[PDB]
Each structure stands twice: as C-alpha cells, then as structure tokens.
Amino acid sequence: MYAVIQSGGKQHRVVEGETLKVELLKAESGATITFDDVLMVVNGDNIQIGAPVVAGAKVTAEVIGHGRHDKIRIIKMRRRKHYRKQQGHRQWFTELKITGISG
Amino acid sequence: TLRLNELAPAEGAKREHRRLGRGIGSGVGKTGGRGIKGQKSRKSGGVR
Amino acid sequence: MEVTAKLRGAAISAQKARLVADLIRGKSVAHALNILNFSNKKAAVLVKKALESAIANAEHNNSLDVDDLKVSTIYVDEGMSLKRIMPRAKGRADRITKRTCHITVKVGV
Amino acid sequence: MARVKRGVVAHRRHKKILARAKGYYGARSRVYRVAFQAVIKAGQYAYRDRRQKKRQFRALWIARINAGARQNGLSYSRMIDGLKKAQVIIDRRVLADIAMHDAVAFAALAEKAKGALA
Amino acid sequence: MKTLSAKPAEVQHDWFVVDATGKTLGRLATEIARRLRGKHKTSYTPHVDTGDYIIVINAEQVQVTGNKALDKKYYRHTEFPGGLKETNFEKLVAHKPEEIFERAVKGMLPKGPLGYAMIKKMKVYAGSEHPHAAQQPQVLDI
RNA sequence: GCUAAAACUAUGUGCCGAAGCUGCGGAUGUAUACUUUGUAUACGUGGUAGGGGAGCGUUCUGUAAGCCGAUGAAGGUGUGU
RNA sequence: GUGAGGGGAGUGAAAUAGAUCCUGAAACCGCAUGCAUACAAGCAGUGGGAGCACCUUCGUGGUGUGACUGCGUACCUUUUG
Ligand SMILES: [Mg+2]
Numbered sequence: 128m129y130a131v132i133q134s135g136g137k138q139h140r141v142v143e144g145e146t147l148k149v150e151l152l153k154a155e156s157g158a159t160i161t162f163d164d165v166l167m168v169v170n171g172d173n174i175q176i177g178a179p180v181v182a183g184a185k186v187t188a189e190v191i192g193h194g195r196h197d198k199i200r201i202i203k204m205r206r207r208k209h210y211r212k213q214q215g216h217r218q219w220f221t222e223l224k225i226t227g228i229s230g
Numbered sequence: 231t232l233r234l235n236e237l238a239p240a241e242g243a244k245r246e247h248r249r250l251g252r253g254i255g256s257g258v259g260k261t262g263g264r265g266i267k268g269q270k271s272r273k274s275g276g277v278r
Numbered sequence: 279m280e281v282t283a284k285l286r287g288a289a290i291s292a293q294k295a296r297l298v299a300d301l302i303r304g305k306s307v308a309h310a311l312n313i314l315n316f317s318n319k320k321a322a323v324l325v326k327k328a329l330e331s332a333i334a335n336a337e338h339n340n341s342l343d344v345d346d347l348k349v350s351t352i353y354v355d356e357g358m359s360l361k362r363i364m365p366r367a368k369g370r371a372d373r374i375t376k377r378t379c380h381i382t383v384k385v386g387v
Numbered sequence: 388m389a390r391v392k393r394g395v396v397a398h399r400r401h402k403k404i405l406a407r408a409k410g411y412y413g414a415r416s417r418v419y420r421v422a423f424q425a426v427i428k429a430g431q432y433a434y435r436d437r438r439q440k441k442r443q444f445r446a447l448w449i450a451r452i453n454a455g456a457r458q459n460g461l462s463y464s465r466m467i468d469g470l471k472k473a474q475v476i477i478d479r480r481v482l483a484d485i486a487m488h489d490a491v492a493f494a495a496l497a498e499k500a501k502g503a504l505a
Numbered sequence: 506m507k508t509l510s511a512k513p514a515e516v517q518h519d520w521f522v523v524d525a526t527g528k529t530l531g532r533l534a535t536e537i538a539r540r541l542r543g544k545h546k547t548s549y550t551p552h553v554d555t556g557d558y559i560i561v562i563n564a565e566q567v568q569v570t571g572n573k574a575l576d577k578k579y580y581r582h583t584e585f586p587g588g589l590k591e592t593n594f595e596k597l598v599a600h601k602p603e604e605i606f607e608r609a610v611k612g613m614l615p616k617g618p619l620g621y622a623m624i625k626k627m628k629v630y631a632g633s634e635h636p637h638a639a640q641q642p643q644v645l646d647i
Numbered sequence: 648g649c650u651a652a653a654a655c656u657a658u659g660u661g662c663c664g665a666a667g668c669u670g671c672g673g674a675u676g677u678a679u680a681c682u683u684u685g686u687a688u689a690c691g692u693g694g695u696a697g698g699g700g701a702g703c704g705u706u707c708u709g710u711a712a713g714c715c716g717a718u719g720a721a722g723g724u725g726u727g728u
Numbered sequence: 729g730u731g732a733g734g735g736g737a738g739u740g741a742a743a744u745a746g747a748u749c750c751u752g753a754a755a756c757c758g759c760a761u762g763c764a765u766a767c768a769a770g771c772a773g774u775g776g777g778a779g780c781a782c783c784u785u786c787g788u789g790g791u792g793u794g795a796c797u798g799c800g801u802a803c804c805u806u807u808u809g
Pocket residue numbers: 257697
C-alpha cells in the first residue's frame with residue numbers, strides 16, 4: 128500500500144517505513160506530523176483518487192531531525208569584461224520517517 | 231582595562247589607505263581608477 | 279623477499295636503456311642472461327652488469343638459490359645531465375645535453 | 388621589518404586549484420594556467436545545468452505519461468485536460484512514476500480523466 | 506532518486522512483422538522509427554534502447570504520391586573530384602528497396618552510437634518471406 | 648520526409664514552451680514600527696568606465712622573562728569538517 | 729676491469745643524515761595495481777546514468793572508473809563589434 132502526500136511545495140509517493148528528506152520544517156525532533164490532505168491511496172486493488180483530496184485518508188510520520196545538503200559553488204564570469212563573482216550554498220532539509228498510512 | 235593590549239581608538243578615527251591594482255575583487259584593479267588611455271592615464275598625466 | 283642491485287651514473291640515455299630493460303622484464307634469470315649475452319646493444323652490457331650484481335647479492339647475502347630466481351622488477355630512471363656547447367654556422371651557439379640513467383634490478387623467487 | 392615572502396601563500400592558492408582540477412586530461416590537471424581556466428568554465432557549466440535539469444526531467448515525465456495514456460487509448464494533451472476538469476492535482480512526476488511502476492492505477496486515472504472529458 | 510531510468514539488462518525486445526504493400530513511405534517510417542526508439546513504452550529512457558524488432562516485407566510495393574516516383578532523386582558523393590552520383594526513386598525501388606527504407610528511417614533516427622544501435626533492429630526484405638520464423642514475430646499494422 | 652498535407656485560407660477546442668509569473672526553503676540593502684534592540688512589515692538586490700561601504704590572509708613592534716613545544720615547533724604531503 | 733656503482737657488516741639518536749650529504753615543493757620522466765578504450769568525428773567539461781573492482785557500521789553506505797545520452801567554439805588586451 129502506498130500514498131501520495133504534499134510537502135514543501137512538492138509531492139511525494141510514500142510507503143510505510145520509508146525515510147525521506149523534505150524542505151525544512153519547524154517541527155522538533157521526535158515529533159509526529161499528520162498529513163490529512165492525501166491525493167491518492169492505493170492498496171493492492173483498492174484505488175482512491177481524491178479529487179482535491181481523499182476524505183478520511185491520513186499519513187503519519189516522525190521527524191528524525193534536520194540537516195544541510197552538500198555545498199554547491201556558484202560561479203559567474205563575463206569574459207573580457209573584468210567581472211567575476213562567486214558564492215557558496217547549503218540547503219536546509221528535514222528528515223521524515225513514514226510511520227503510518229490509513230485510507 | 232588600562233592595559234597595553236586593552237586600548238583602542240574611537241570609532242571612525244582610523245581608515246585603511248586605498249591600494250590600487252590588486253585584483254578584481256577590490257574594485258580598483260587593473261587600471262586603478264585612471265580610465266582607459268589618454269594623457270591623464272599616464273604617469274604624471276595632469277595638465278598645469 | 280627480492281634483492282636489489284642499483285647501477286648509478288651509466289653514460290647512456292634512459293630512453294635507450296629502457297628498450298633493453300623491457301626486453302627482459304619478467305623473465306627467468308638464465309633466459310635473461312642468454313638474451314643479454316647475444317644482444318648487440320650497448321645498454322645490454324650495463325643491464326648484464328647490474329643483473330649479475332643482483333644475483334651475486336641474492337646468493338652471498340641472502341643464501342638464495344639462483345636456479346629459482348626471476349627478474350621480478352626492473353626500471354630505469356633519468357640521471358644528472360652534463361652540459362656542453364656546440365658551435366654552429368654564422369656564430370650561433372647551441373646547448374648540448376649528455377644524459378645519464380640509473381638502473382634498478384630486483385630478483386626474487 | 389615589513390619584507391614579506393610570498394611562497395607559502397602562493398603555493399597554497401595554486402594547490403587548491405590543482406586539487407579542484409582532479410580528473411582532467413593532460414595539462415588541464417597538471418599546469419596551473421590551464422587548470423585555472425578549466426575550473427571556471429566548469430563552474431559556469433554547472434550554473435547553467437542546474438537550470439537545464441528541471442526542463443529535461445519535465446520532458447521525461449511528459450514522455451512517459453504520453454506513453455501510458457496512448458496505451459490506455461488517449462493522448463497526453465487530452466488526459467491533462469481531463470484531469471484538470473476532474474480537479475485532480477497529481478503532478479507530472481508522480482504520474483510518470485505511476486505509469487512506470489503500476490499500470491492498474493494509471494488505467495484508473497485515465498478512466499477518470501476520460502469520464503471527466505465526457 | 507525517485508525517477509528511475511530503465512536498466513538495459515532488464516529490457517525485453519519483442520518481434521513484429523509489417524507488410525508495406527500499398528502504404529505511404531513517410532507515414533510508415535514515422536511509426537517504424539517510433540517503435541525502434543521505444544517511445545511507445547512507459548519505460549522510455551533517452552539514453553537507453555528500449556525498442557522492438559521490426560521486420561518489413563513486400564518493401565518494393567511502397568508507394569509515393571504526386572510525381573515523386575519520377576521527381577524524387579537520391580544523391581551520393583564519391584570523394585573524387587566531380588564524383589556526384591545521382592538516381593531516381595523508380596529505379597531505386599526496383600534495385601534496392603532496402604536502401605529506400607534505410608534512408609527513410611535513418612533520416613528520422615538520432616545521429617550517434619545509440620541511433621546506429623537502434624537502426625540495426627530493422628530488417629527489410631523485398632519478398633513476402635523472411636528468415637526469422639524462429640523468432641515468432643507477431644503481425645503489426647502501422 | 649509531406650498532396651481529402653505534415654501546404655494555404657477561415658473558424659474552435661486542448662496542449663508544449665523561458666533564468667517571465669506562482670509555490671516552498673534561505674541570504675542581503677533601504678525605509679517604517681517597536682525601545683519586550685534584532686525582531687516584523689513594504690519595496691528592492693543584471694552590469695563596463697567609475698563612486699561609496701565592509702572584510703580575509705602575509706612580514707615585523709608592544710602586550711611577551713607571558714602561552715605552546717623532544718610525550719615533537721616551523722615547513723612538506725593526505726584525510727575529515 | 730684492483731674501474732664507476734651497489735649489496736651485506738659496522739658507527740651513529742637518525743645513513744631515502746654517506747660526503748654537491750638539514751628539510752626536499754612544482755614543471756618533467758619511470759614502474760605496479762583498479763576500471764575504461766580499436767564502427768567512431770570538434771575548447772575535452774557540465775547535468776544525467778548502466779556496468780565493473782575494492783572497502784564496508786552490508787545501506788537510500790564510502791572510494792576508484794565511466795559504456796550511453798541533452799547542452800556546450802579557451803583566457804587576456806583593444807574595440808561599434
Ligand atoms: Mg568598477
């Protein structure tokens with residue numbers, strides 16, 4: 128059985144016991160997060176495609192923690208124009224473990 | 231307080247002298263503010 | 279457990295010596311000695327001298343048996359170069375490089 | 388005093404560029420003048436490709452959804468319209484994943500889209 | 506990541522047989538190229554070959570519209586000075602129909618090693634018989 | 648490669664399409680509010696010649712008869728952060 | 729070869745401290761191991777991505793390599809360019 132949820136301006140297809148990384152959230156470590164807006168639920172042969180959302184479907188997850196992705200370098204150079212600029216970046220993320228899916 | 235390593239001047243009393251021709255990042259690299267060619271770009275390029 | 283012999287300062291270019299070194303790399307001591315004996319190259323004499331020194335070391339210092347020894351490792355390295363001047367036409371002068379090489383031979387069972 | 392030798396700092400700065408130029412061919416990984424240019428161009432390429440990647444992956448998802456829809460007897464352009472008129476908001480990435488890994492669910496989505504179209 | 510590309514080891518290649526009698530060359534070639542590249546499968550991957558084998562029979566019966574039978578000309582160049590060789594569709598379809606289909610589908614396939622790999626899966630025969638009965642191809646109309 | 652077009656004319660539904668706009672996360676300049684003073688709101692942040700602001704490293708002088716160092720300093724070469 | 733050079737032994741805290749002898753970077757030149765490479769056309773990278781070798785806390789892990797694929801004509805000066 129799998130479900131479709133929304134987080135951080137993006138959609139994710141998840142199953143029970145899956146660990147994933149999403150845009151940074153304000154929840155604390157060890158907290159429980161409930162997604163009550165489930166677009167799709169599929170269980171073997173029962174398929175629910177909520178028009179905006181599936182009524183009654185809920186997905187529960189646990190917040191493992193927060194972290195930063197690997198560094199990325201930004202480079203800009205305009206040849207023959209005496210212009211150079213650079214900058215680093217590290218994106219924040221929150222780690223979630225899917226603990227429950229219910230239709 | 232009152233130690234040879236605990237004395238500082240007032241804020242804004244000191245500034246760093248401009249150093250020309252030391253890279254792009256400084257903002258005054260290469261031509262060093264003199265522009266491109268001409269009399270005034272040369273050494274002692276001002277008119278009387 | 280491979281014993282070494284090193285010949286330093288040989289008056290020949292490493293490029294030339296390495297052809298002879300490749301000819302014998304990996305082969306047994308007796309076959310390599312035959313090849314060096316019947317080669318007509320100048321580097322063959324130097325490689326023979328180094329290989330025989332290595333075999334003598336293997337026998338005298340480590341009590342190894344020559345019958346079971348093979349050329350396990352061999353390579354040549356560039357050495358200090360002499361500098362000379364060659365006169366040319368119309369007064370122009372040319373630099374001349376006289377190259378040197380080091381020969382390392384290792385024999386083991 | 389105020390006489391400064393520059394060897395240590397210059398060597399460190401050159402070594403950083405050489406280390407960043409690992410894996411390049413010939414002089415591009417050995418000679419500092421050549422290596423320095425290689426790193427800047429690589430940075431520019433990466434800056435452009437971080438934008439190109441989204442376009443490429445969107446195109447891939449659209450292709451897979453089109454294949455699934457035509458297998459179910461409909462076109463991609465009409466399936467998108469049917470889903471929008473059915474008020475489904477599943478995105479192209481999820482639709483492509485479903486098309487690749489679960490034919491029955493994608494068939495159900497296609498049926499819903501065509502029903503909304505009718 | 507979550508979007509998975511097809512693994513070449515896991516690809517299956519089916520075999521289809523197509524009769525070209527009384528069909529338009531270009532509109533047949535588009536479908537042939539599509540099936541050779543694998544766009545029809547939901548596991549399409551631009552850097553992997555996921556197509557099927559296509560056998561074409563009765564190739565010399567392929568048709569063209571208008572006056573193209575006499576007016577469509579095929580060119581090649583030997584790298585010798587002034588070495589330009591020039592022919593016509595009427596003669597080419599009588600001589601080497603396989604060349605007709607090969608040019609038509611090559612023009613539509615990608616130009617590279619992967620395109621060369623894809624084009625090898627097309628088998629063209631003038632007659633109504635083919636030597637691949639062992640592969641048990643299925644009838645396909647396109 | 649294309650001919651009741653994959654051409655031209657007219658009409659109508661969809662769709663693709665950019666670093667444009669929207670969504671989510673982060674940084675920064677100005678102005679306005681708090682005086683619970685670095686926290687919010689609003690608008691901005693392509694750039695040559697130039698102007699303005701803020702910083703990182705290197706050698707020496709005092710702080711230093713101090714602090715580290717043969718249980719290993721400077722220098723050289725890798726790894727992690 | 730009573731050569732040059734080296735291998736043992738011995739001295740020395742240390743002998744890749746052995747006499748053009750403190751440390752010992754780079755260009756440049758060898759050897760060994762892993763992977764790739766002899767049907768394919770271009771500033772040599774970048775965004776993807778299969779397979780292989782080793783390590784492995786046996787993984788949505790780490791380190792090497794990079795079949796196939798989208799995009800892509802160096803830098804500095806001087807110029808309307
Ligand atoms: Mg400026």
